[PDB]
Amino acid sequence: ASGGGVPTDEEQATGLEREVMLAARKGQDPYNILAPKATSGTKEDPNLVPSITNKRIVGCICEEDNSTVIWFWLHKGEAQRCPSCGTHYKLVPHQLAH
Amino acid sequence: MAYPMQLGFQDATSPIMEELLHFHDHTLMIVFLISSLVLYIISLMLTTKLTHTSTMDAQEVETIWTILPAIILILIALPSLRILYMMDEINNPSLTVKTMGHQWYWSYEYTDYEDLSFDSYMIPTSELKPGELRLLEVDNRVVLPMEMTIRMLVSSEDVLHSWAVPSLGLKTDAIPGRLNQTTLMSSRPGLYYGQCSEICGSNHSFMPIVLELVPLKYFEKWSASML
Amino acid sequence: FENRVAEKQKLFQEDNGLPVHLKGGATDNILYRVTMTLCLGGTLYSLYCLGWASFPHK
Amino acid sequence: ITAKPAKTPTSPKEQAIGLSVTFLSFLLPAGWVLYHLDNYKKS
Amino acid sequence: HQTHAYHMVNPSPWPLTGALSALLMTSGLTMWFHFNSMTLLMIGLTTNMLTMYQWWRDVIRESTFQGHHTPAVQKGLRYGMILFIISEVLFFTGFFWAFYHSSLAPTPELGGCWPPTGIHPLNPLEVPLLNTSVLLASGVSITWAHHSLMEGDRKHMLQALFITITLGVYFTLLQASEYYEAPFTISDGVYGSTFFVATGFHGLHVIIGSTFLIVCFFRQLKFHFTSNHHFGFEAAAWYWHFVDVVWLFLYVSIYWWGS
Amino acid sequence: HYEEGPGKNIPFSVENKWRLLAMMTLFFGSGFAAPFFIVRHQLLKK
Amino acid sequence: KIKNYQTAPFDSRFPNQNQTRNCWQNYLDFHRCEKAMTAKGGDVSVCEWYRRVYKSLCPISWVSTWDDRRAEGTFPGKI
Amino acid sequence: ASAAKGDHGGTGARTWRFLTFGLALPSVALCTLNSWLHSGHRERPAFIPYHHLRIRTKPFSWGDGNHTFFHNPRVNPLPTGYEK
Amino acid sequence: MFINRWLFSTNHKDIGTLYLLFGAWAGMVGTALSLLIRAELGQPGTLLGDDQIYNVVVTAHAFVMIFFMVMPIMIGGFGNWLVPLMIGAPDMAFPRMNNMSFWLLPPSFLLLLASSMVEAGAGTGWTVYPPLAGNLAHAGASVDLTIFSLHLAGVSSILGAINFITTIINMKPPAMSQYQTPLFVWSVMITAVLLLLSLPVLAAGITMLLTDRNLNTTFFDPAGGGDPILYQHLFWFFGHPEVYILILPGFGMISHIVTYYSGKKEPFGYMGMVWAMMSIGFLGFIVWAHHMFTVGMDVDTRAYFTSATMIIAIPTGVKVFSWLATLHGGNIKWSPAMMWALGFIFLFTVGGLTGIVLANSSLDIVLHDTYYVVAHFHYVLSMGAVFAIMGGFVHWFPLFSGYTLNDTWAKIHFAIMFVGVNMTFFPQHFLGLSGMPRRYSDYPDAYTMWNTISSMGSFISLTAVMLMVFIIWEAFASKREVLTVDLTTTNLEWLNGCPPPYHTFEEPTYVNLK
Ligand SMILES: CCCCCCCCCCCCCCCCCC(=O)OCC(COC(=O)CCCCCCCCCCCCCCCCC)OC(=O)CCCCCCCCCCCCCCCCC
Ligand code: HEA
Ligand code: HEA
Ligand SMILES: CCCCC/C=C\C/C=C/C/C=C/C/C=C\CCCC(=O)O[C@H](COC(=O)CCCCCCCCCCCCCCCCC)COP(=O)(O)OCCN
Ligand SMILES: CCCCC/C=C/C/C=C/CCCCCCCC(=O)O[C@H](COC(=O)CCCCCCCCCCCCCCC)COP(=O)(O)OCC[N+](C)(C)C
Ligand SMILES: CCCCCC/C=C\CCCCCCCCCC(=O)O[C@H](COC(=O)CCCCCCCCCCCCCCC)COP(=O)(O)OC[C@@H](O)CO
Ligand SMILES: CCCCCC/C=C\CCCCCCCCCC(=O)O[C@H](COC(=O)CCCCCCCCCCCCCCC)COP(=O)(O)OC[C@@H](O)CO
Ligand SMILES: CCCCCC/C=C\CCCCCCCCCC(=O)O[C@H](COC(=O)CCCCCCCCCCCCCCC)COP(=O)(O)OC[C@@H](O)CO
Ligand SMILES: CCCCCCCCCCO[C@H]1O[C@H](CO)[C@@H](O[C@H]2O[C@H](CO)[C@@H](O)[C@H](O)[C@@H]2O)[C@H](O)[C@H]1O
Ligand SMILES: CCCCCCCCCCO[C@H]1O[C@H](CO)[C@@H](O[C@H]2O[C@H](CO)[C@@H](O)[C@H](O)[C@@H]2O)[C@H](O)[C@H]1O
Ligand SMILES: CCCCCCCCCCO[C@H]1O[C@H](CO)[C@@H](O[C@H]2O[C@H](CO)[C@@H](O)[C@H](O)[C@@H]2O)[C@H](O)[C@H]1O
Ligand SMILES: CCCCCCCCCCO[C@H]1O[C@H](CO)[C@@H](O[C@H]2O[C@H](CO)[C@@H](O)[C@H](O)[C@@H]2O)[C@H](O)[C@H]1O
Ligand SMILES: C[C@H](CCC(=O)O)[C@H]1CC[C@H]2[C@@H]3[C@H](O)C[C@@H]4C[C@H](O)CC[C@]4(C)[C@H]3C[C@H](O)[C@]12C
Ligand SMILES: C[C@H](CCC(=O)O)[C@H]1CC[C@H]2[C@@H]3[C@H](O)C[C@@H]4C[C@H](O)CC[C@]4(C)[C@H]3C[C@H](O)[C@]12C
Ligand code: CUA
Ligand SMILES: [Cu+2]
Ligand SMILES: [Mg+2]
Ligand code: NA
Ligand SMILES: [O-]
Ligand SMILES: [Zn+2]
């Protein structure tokens, strides 16, 4: 037998390391470790951008392998289109209190 | 030696050094070109109002930009490597002088036949005879017979020096415990000057070389007059 | 021995706004201030050394 | 690059000072070492 | 509030105390070499150990207690420790080079031959063989420890780690006896020079090595490490294997082919 | 939290431009003065 | 051969600008060839060739120093 | 290789323990048997004042400054010969 | 707070600022040392005294401009400022370690300044070659203090490289591949691998020199079987890689500036510029013996190094021809910083060829240890690496500060500096052809005119350096606040306002996988 005596992450993980381990298991990425998956990016089906504030900077790789990310500020409001390819993006405020 | 306002190389006293001048002349033809094509094309791009800020395609122009310079570079190397192997070559030398570098003078050994050895210091500005070249003149010259293949072995009994005679196309480092071989061929007689080409301390500036080339028969006497 | 990793965790997450290197109480400060004394102390010394070694002697 | 106006505009006269002071801060001490050079050697 | 998974580090005094520790240690050695005094050097050395202690204390505080080492932070720690081992590698390379320059072309001054005239090399089948055996054992022992830890056998991980460190201590004592018995010194030109400086720097790397495992052994005592988050023991293992392969290269290069 | 914005993110003060000129005078000037006073001291020994 | 000796020829064994071993090997080849020729009751004037070479290429001080060490018993090369 | 045993895909911590106690430490015992015999004060070398050994370009920063750090009077001559 | 903000920092920006300040101060000392040099050569005869005191000044000039000016600004200043903002990272992998890399640099300098005030200083050259650098010619603490400067200065660099590489590799947006990071970002990553791999071998070499001076080793002493040349190899094994370190980030900035001020949305041939520097990096490691062509090494070797040294021209060409294509159909905005970049492109290409000359073992026979060499590497360093620095500095000064400079003044600065370095160095081509050696306080009568002229140039370059201290003041004096910046859509650094907040990317950028 082992005896054990080695604690496990489930038991001894605390702080942010825990919050990631617990969030990951429920299928959520609150701390932005995975890359979001893209939509059609039309006005009807825009790219939803979860934020903790009234703006967040989006980067747009307009086509695969493109050397240049298009960056701009995204605001609460109507959807916004990339000034390169006209792909649509929409801000989705929430929070992380309790 | 070097004269006022001089732009380019000392005049070739040995054929190797000649070979360099013409090779150097080749390499500068191309330098003068690439520098003008780059200065020209720069000005071309800046002297139009017409514009094109949308994405541009590489592959096909980046081909010219590599295959040309690779040819331009074989063209330079092909002769550079000829002249480098030409400096080695199975030559047949008739005289073997060893030079030693000291803080801060040069000693000479001609030891083929006899045990002839002597030092070679600089003439202090205060003691030059009117006509004598400041920082260049030595009390005892390196008399060598002209128009013959000579083997010079270089080493130092202290710090690093460099044994250096521009006009003949010679420079070899003095490395303590190391006997470095070069070969010396004057096409002409006369006086042929050089300086220490490694930083050796307080008087690096002030430890020059002067060859005196003369006939074989004016040499053998000079040899015998020094023992 | 027995696991006391959970006590030391609560001590270090406590919102007292002490930076990590003082969050252990009393000792950390005595180790901090003792450390900084010798560094700035031996720095001053080492200048005087440089300073002495610059001039000729005897 | 668009900027505001200056909050504390540095008039010519003020510029002329800063230029005067800055040139002297380099020039003056260098001068005093280079002028007393002869004196340092007689030792 | 942050929504990235990285570490924002509190303002630390220790970079300053370390930097200062260096000015003390280097003006200190200079003060020992030239004015033949160790005042400054002991001041430097002490500040350094106090800086090293406190710094890595806070790293554990930050990881074990505050849980700041998220899967990201911990994957930057690997990239870090590995680029470090590269830098140690290129340093040791510099010494092998010094060796291979001097043995492969001996000078008139030595006899024109390797080994030099007057040098009585150690037999590589004697204590050096026994040194080589101890280390390779301790890569069998630490690899046990890792598997014990991963399987959650606290006990067999302490036994495995204890065997590793005791071998390390046993390598060190063996090595310091072999320095003493050596019929040649660091002064015995370029044989002694290569031999001491290179087998020497390696030796301090084993003491660094055993120090870092002893930390691991006390930290495991206090239950710091899980089945799955034990980077401080990975860093130590890798470093230990590096310290072993370097030895192997020394043994084959300096002891055997240069005997 | 530390001060944000223009003239706040430096370890000197730009609040008054004539103290600032004195500060840049020393900083840059000291550094340029240094080699000269160092060459002096090397000649002033022997 | 030695009647027309000017200086040392090219040695196909030493083709490179570094000739430290040339001076070295021809000095061994004398002092071994000489220990050889006085330990069998022969003529030393066979060993002359290597004496000339080693002197044509070897610096004075280097011979100076190896001589003082053959005498002092501190010459590291086997003879 | 000059080595042959046979894969034991059976458990981790157990196999590397097997290997530790079975192979690794036995090596260190054999290797010790083989040194605790072959290691013994072998005859010390006759002194020759060879100029490429016992370098002193600058005194050491300790002792009388003519003794190395792990200097052993029995086997380690000085520049001027052995110590009594 | 102040002690917590500036002494104790873990802010990638606040640390960049510390370096820009250190490297600015270093430059002041570097300049003085360079003026002294040309005081001594500006007329025949002797001014200070013998080659000794002269070469302590020459040597010091080299270590300060290289180790305390160009690497500290370029890598630690612009690295620590721009790198994290170009990849939307909140700071550096190892921010505590980042600060020790800074504070290790005052010490490092002070051991250098100590060396020049102890005994007769270490006039050895920046190569520090035994046996001159050894304990018989340079007996004393000087050369030991110089070896210790470099130890600390190499620990700063190697720790700082571990930080960048771990930052650029690990801390991008997940969606972002390496192939969508800016050129600067790439330049710094590559420049950190060169540091990481070369500085350890530099350290190893200067360690054997300490133990030859102090512990009676004979690594470089023929008395104990050693070889002075061994040292030349280990040092130059570092020393070629050291110079592609000093230009690579200049490539970076130059790719940035020429792009932003041509109004283009990316530079021409992105992946071309990636292949180029990864090549220049790689071939920069296999060329070190081109510094040793008069040491007396086998002909077959000398011809490899000739040929290998020249291959570097192809990938460097690609970069010259790219920048030039990045201008092609640009909307050229004639800023100071464009002027700095343009000058780079032509005076780098001058210096770059003058070193293809040097590649030929043949010529280097005659050109070795002449001013021709000094001329080559003052066109690539004084008229490249410093042009990148002034270019960048001019373009990004408002991001760090939040204020504008006076653009007229800043072209007046460019104007005078151009005339000064070209008059300083263009004559040094002629001197070394006429065979004037390096590292001489005094010269044969013949060489006077060019040496007069060369030094006049060095007095124009001083007016430049003094003007730039008064131009930095004006801007802070005046406090004109940046309002709006162009081309932000392709230049993420400018997106958080001039200057950006203590904490940037507190909430990371959104980049999605298509
Ligand atoms: C203010 C700074 C000072 C400038 C110096 C000017 C000099 C003025 C003095 C009197 C001047 C008389 C001659 C003018 C030519 C001067 C330089 C030249 O071409 O000299 C040729 C050679 C040396 O060759 C010789 O062997 C000289 C032979 C000359 C024969 C011509 C006929 C006789 C007239 C010349 C008298 C000497 C003849 C006797 C000698 C016979 C053989 C030696 O020099 C070299 O190798 C120099 C290496 C530099 C390479 C850099 C690449 C180019 C950068 C810029 C390119 C684009 C332009 C934009 C340009 C913009 C960027 C700069
Ligand atoms: C930033 C600094 C820097 C840079 C970028 C360079 C770039 C180069 N250097 Fe130089 N160098 C130094 C700094 C630098 N160097 C220093 C400090 C020393 C001396 C150390 C000392 O001794 O004190 C030195 C010394 C030095 C020597 C030794 C000389 C001697 O001691 O006698 C040699 C020999 O090969 C050399 C070669 C090169 C080459 C081939 C390049 C290449 O990288 C240049 C390539 C670029 C171009 C050629 C222009 C762009 C290309 C094109 C436009 C393509 C078309 C070209 C052709 C068809 C040929 N350098
Ligand atoms: C980066 C390296 C660098 C730089 C910039 C310089 C700049 C200059 N150098 Fe130097 N030099 C060397 C590195 C450098 N040099 C090296 C490595 C050697 C060989 C050393 C040896 O032989 O051992 C050498 C040798 C050397 C010699 C030969 C010594 C000899 O053989 O006797 C001479 C002679 O005139 C000389 C002159 C100058 C001059 C006039 C400048 C001027 O062009 C400089 C003008 C002033 C500046 C360019 C100041 C810039 C300051 C800033 C940009 C800071 C501001 C920034 C901020 C506020 C952010 N140099
Ligand atoms: C079992 C191994 C024991 C480990 C060593 C323990 C204590 C002292 C050494 C500390 C570790 C550092 C080693 C590096 C320096 C030199 C190699 C030392 C190897 C050694 O220990 O050398 C001994 C001599 O030591 C001597 O001189 C005295 C040596 C003391 C001088 C200190 C060295 C100072 C220089 C350090 C340079 C710092 C470089 C760091 C670079 C940082 C990264 C770039 C050898 O014994 P010996 O009597 O000559 O001959 C045997 C005769 N029976
Ligand atoms: C060593 C020195 C050697 C120098 C090298 C010289 C190169 C020779 C090239 C010459 C051709 C000039 C091309 C550059 C001008 C821009 C061309 C352009 O604007 O072309 C567009 C490029 O955009 C697209 O497709 C996208 C693809 C872009 C393709 C065009 C750009 C290629 C060239 C750019 C490189 C400039 C470098 C110059 C400075 C070094 C394409 O538009 P269309 O298909 O509708 O055109 C149709 C026009 N017809 C009917 C008259 C043919
Ligand atoms: C021969 C030796 C003598 C020296 C030669 C002169 C040197 C240089 C002086 C350059 C004069 C200014 C240059 C013209 C434009 C740039 C700077 C300027 O004049 O300052 C403007 C102030 O405006 C305004 O007139 C508002 C009022 C303030 C005016 C500012 C300038 C007045 C003083 C200039 C003269 C200085 C004298 C120096 C003598 C040592 C602001 O800049 P803008 O023009 O709005 O645009 C810049 C953009 O970045 C902003 O979006
Ligand atoms: C003259 C003086 C010579 C030197 C004498 C001795 C010096 C040093 C002793 C050896 C070094 C020991 C370092 C121990 C650091 C302990 C902290 C630690 O190990 O920290 C770990 C991170 O690793 C990390 O930063 C990585 C830590 C890596 C440390 C690097 C060690 C090598 C550096 C030594 C310096 C070499 C100098 C060169 C020699 C000439 C923390 O993460 P975990 O452990 O996974 O925690 C997770 C769980 O707790 C909860 O789930
Ligand atoms: C003779 C005298 C000459 C002078 C020599 C002495 C010089 C310096 C001595 C001071 C060094 C001791 C102080 C401890 C430093 C530990 C740094 C460290 O270990 O840093 C870690 C990362 O480095 C990693 O793993 C990867 C990197 C680990 C390297 C460990 C430190 C190296 C120090 C020696 C460098 C020698 C160079 C070797 C090559 C020649 C952690 O990064 P931090 O930002 O700290 O925190 C981030 C938090 O997320 C952690 O929870
Ligand atoms: C608060 C933190 C900062 C603390 C700084 C204050 C320390 C002041 C200490 C005074 O210095 C002493 O240092 C050495 C003590 O060992 C002596 O060296 C001596 O050591 C050798 C013997 O070990 C002798 O041979 C030499 O003569 C040499 O002078 C030295 O005489 C003595 O002045
Ligand atoms: C290369 C870097 C710098 C180059 C350009 C420097 C030009 C120097 C600027 C003036 O600096 C000097 O000016 C005076 C000389 O003109 C010196 O006065 C000296 O001479 C006066 C009279 O000759 C005395 O009365 C003074 O006290 C003093 O001794 C003064 O002390 C010194 O600062
Ligand atoms: C040169 C120095 C001498 C020491 C050498 C150190 C070699 C490095 C080995 C690291 O361990 C890895 O490889 C083992 C061997 O392939 C695996 O063992 C075991 O792991 C499996 C499951 O964990 C078991 O099923 C198997 O029996 C297997 O032996 C183990 O998993 C894996 O971590
Ligand atoms: C990179 C890391 C740097 C590592 C630094 C290592 C420091 C080394 C310690 C120096 O040791 C000293 O110890 C004693 C002073 O405390 C003295 O010993 C004396 O006592 C010995 C007895 O052990 C005798 O052999 C001699 O008489 C000797 O002088 C002597 O001054 C010196 O040996
Ligand atoms: C395949 C690779 C990367 C492009 C991409 O994957 O996006 C590209 C980019 C840079 C290219 C190289 C450079 O453009 C330089 C050379 C250009 C020549 O026309 C072909 C070979 C040449 C050596 C190129 C080979 C290949 O086409 C490279 C290496
Ligand atoms: C203290 C602890 C018992 C309590 C626990 O399991 O935490 C035990 C577990 C394993 C033990 C160690 C291991 O058994 C390995 C060593 C065995 C030696 O015979 C005694 C010391 C030795 C170093 C032990 C010390 C101590 O008794 C340890 C560390
Ligand atoms: Cu002898 Cu320079
Ligand atoms: Cu190079
Ligand atoms: Mg040289
Ligand atoms: Na002069
Ligand atoms: O170079
Ligand atoms: Zn888009």
Numbering used by the authors:
A (entry chain F): 1 to 98
B (entry chain B): 1 to 227
C (entry chain J): 1 to 58
D (entry chain M): 1 to 43
E (entry chain C): 3 to 261
F (entry chain L): 2 to 47
G (entry chain H): 7 to 85
H (entry chain G): 1 to 84
Lines from the paper:
For the SFX measurements, microcrystals of bCcO were prepared in the resting O state using a previously reported protocol. The structure was solved and refined to a resolution of 2.38 Å. The structural markers for the oxidation states of the four redox centers confirm that the enzyme is in the fully oxidized O state. In the FO-FC electron density map associated with the SFX data, a large 2-lobe electron density is evident in the BNC, indicating the presence of ligands coordinated to heme a3 iron and CuB. As guided by the resonance Raman data, we modeled the heme a3 ligand density with a OH− ion. In addition, we modeled the CuB ligand density with a water molecule, as the coexistence of two negatively charged hydroxide ions in the BNC is expected to be energetically unfavorable. The Fe-OH−, CuB-H2O, and Fe-CuB bond lengths, which were unrestrained during the refinement, are determined to be 1.90, 2.14, and 4.74 Å, respectively. The O–O distance between the two oxygen ligands is 2.53 Å, which is shorter than a typical H-bond, but is consistent with a strong low-barrier H-bond. Intriguingly, our current work reveals that W2 is not present in the O state, signifying that Y244 is in the neutral protonated form, consistent with the conclusion drawn from computational studies carried out by Blomberg. Y244 in all the intermediate states active in proton translocation (PR, F, OH, and EH) is in the deprotonated tyrosinate form, suggesting that the premature protonation of the tyrosinate (Y244) during the OH→O transition, without the input of any electron into the BNC, perturbs the charge balance in the BNC of the O state, thereby disabling the release of pumped protons out of the PLS upon reduction.
Cytochrome c oxidase (CcO) is an essential enzyme in mitochondrial and bacterial respiration. It catalyzes the four-electron reduction of molecular oxygen to water and harnesses the chemical energy to translocate four protons across biological membranes. Mammalian CcO is a large integral membrane protein comprised of 13 subunits. It contains four redox active centers, CuA, heme a, and a heme a3/CuB binuclear center (BNC).
